[PDB]
Amino acid sequence: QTLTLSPNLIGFNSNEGEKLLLTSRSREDFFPLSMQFVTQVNQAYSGVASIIMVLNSLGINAPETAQYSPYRVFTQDNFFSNEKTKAVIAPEVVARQGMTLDELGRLIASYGVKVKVNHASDTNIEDFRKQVAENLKQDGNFVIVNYLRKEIGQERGGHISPLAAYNEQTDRFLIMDVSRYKYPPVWVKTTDLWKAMNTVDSVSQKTRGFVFVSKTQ
C-alpha cells in the first residue's frame, strides 16, 4: 500500500531512480544511511527516525538498554532515554505534533554531536545546493531536511527525512523517506525541495530548512 508519486519526483523504486544513484557523484552518505534505514514507528516520529539514522551512521555512543544489550544502538524508543533529550521536548509530545526544525537541532545537540540549523529564511537555494552536495561527498557528516510534502507533490504536511545523495545531471536530491509504509525514497528537484523548506511552520512561526550533523572531533 504505497502512494503514487507525482510526475515531478523520481522514485528510488524504479529503474530511473536506481540509475540516478549509480550515476551520481555525490553519494558517500547513501551507504551508511541505507544500513540504518528505519520506519518511523508512528506517523509523527519522522524526526526521531531521521535522527537515529544519522546518529547510528555517525557511530556515536549509543544508549545502553535491556533491548539489545550487550549491543548498543539508537532506536526510536531509546532515543529519549537521555534526560537532556526529553528536556528539549518530551516524547509524548513528539508522538502528537512532531518536532520543529529548531527542536530537531536541539534534540541532536543533546547527544553532544555538532549541529548547524539552516532555516530557509536565512539562506538561499544556491548555498543549499552547493553545501548539501558537498556534504554528500564526505563521510562523518550528514544532512537532514524538514519540508512541506505538499510543495514537492506529496501528502502533505511538514516532514523530516535525511538526504543520501545528489544527482548532478538532474539536479535532484535523494530523500531517504522514513515514512516507508507511505512513500519510497524519492529523487526531488532542488527547485521543489527548496520551495518545500521555504515554508513557515505554524508551530514555530519560522521557516523549515535543513540541518548539518557531524561529530565534534
Residue 119 engages ligand GSH in binding (rule: CB under 6 A): no
Residue 44 engages ligand GSH in binding (rule: CB under 6 A): yes
The single residue among 130, 139, 168, 169 that binds Ca ion, judged by CB under 5 A, is: 139
Residue 112 engages ligand GSH in binding (rule: CB under 6 A): no
By residue count, the chain amounts to 217
Q: Scanning the structure block, which residue is given the C-alpha cell 535532484?
A: 172
Indicate the SS3 state at residue 115. Answer: strand
User: Which of the choices Ca ion, its own copies, ligand GSH, none does residue 35 contact, using the CB cut-off of 5 to 8 A by kind?
Assistant: its own copies
Grid coordinates belonging to 11: 522514485
Q: Which residues are annotated as a binding site for Ca(2+)?
A: 15, 18, 28-29, 135, 138-139, 141
| 104 touches 79 (CB < 8 A) | no
Cα dihedral sign, 4-6-7-13? negative
Of residues 137, 140, 146, the one with CA closest to residue 165: 137
User: Which of the choices its own copies, ligand GSH, Ca ion, none does residue 138 contact, using the CB cut-off of 5 to 8 A by kind?
Assistant: Ca ion
CA distances from 1 to 4, 115, 122, 180, 181 (A): 10, 35, 38, 10, 7
- Applying CB under 5 A, which part among 86-94, 120-128, 133-141, 204-212 lies near Ca ion? 133-141
Q: Scanning the structure block, which residue is given the C-alpha cell 511538514?
A: 158
Q: Which is nearer to ligand GSH, 6 or 138 (CB)?
A: 6
Q: Which residues bind ligand GSH (CB under 6 A)?
A: 40, 43-47, 97-100, 146, 149, 157-160, 179, 182, 201, 203, 208
